[PDB]
Amino acid sequence: ARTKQTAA
Amino acid sequence: SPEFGYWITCCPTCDVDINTWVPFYSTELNKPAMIYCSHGDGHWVHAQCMDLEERTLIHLSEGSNKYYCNEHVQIARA
Ligand SMILES: [Zn+2]
Ligand SMILES: [Zn+2]
Numbered sequence: 001a002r003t004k005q006t007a008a
Numbered sequence: 009s010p011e012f013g014y015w016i017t018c019c020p021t022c023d024v025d026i027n028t029w030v031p032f033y034s035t036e037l038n039k040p041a042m043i044y045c046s047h048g049d050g051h052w053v054h055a056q057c058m059d060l061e062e063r064t065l066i067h068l069s070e071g072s073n074k075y076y077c078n079e080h081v082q083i084a085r086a
Contacts, residue, residue, distance in 0.1 A: 004041060
């Protein structure tokens with residue numbers, strides 16, 4: 001799923 | 009009229025506000041984590057407002073599975 005602000 | 013970006017009112021019970029927000033997930037700093045709901049024409053919702061645990065959110069972001077917000081998840085995709 002597409003997401004935002006999930007990058008460690 | 010309706011609104012794009014990180015500071016939208018994502019659902020009827022949305023708790024994310026540009027005037028009150030603080031980091032919750034370990035991946036957040038100055039912006040709320042969001043996830044795309046594939047229902048209809050699709051829309052974005054705040055992961056926190058969906059009561060998504062961090063690992064569920066991260067696993068979703070690491071795969072090709074589609075997500076459906078709490079509002080539309082029970083809708084017959086038939
Ligand atoms: Zn929200
Ligand atoms: Zn939805």
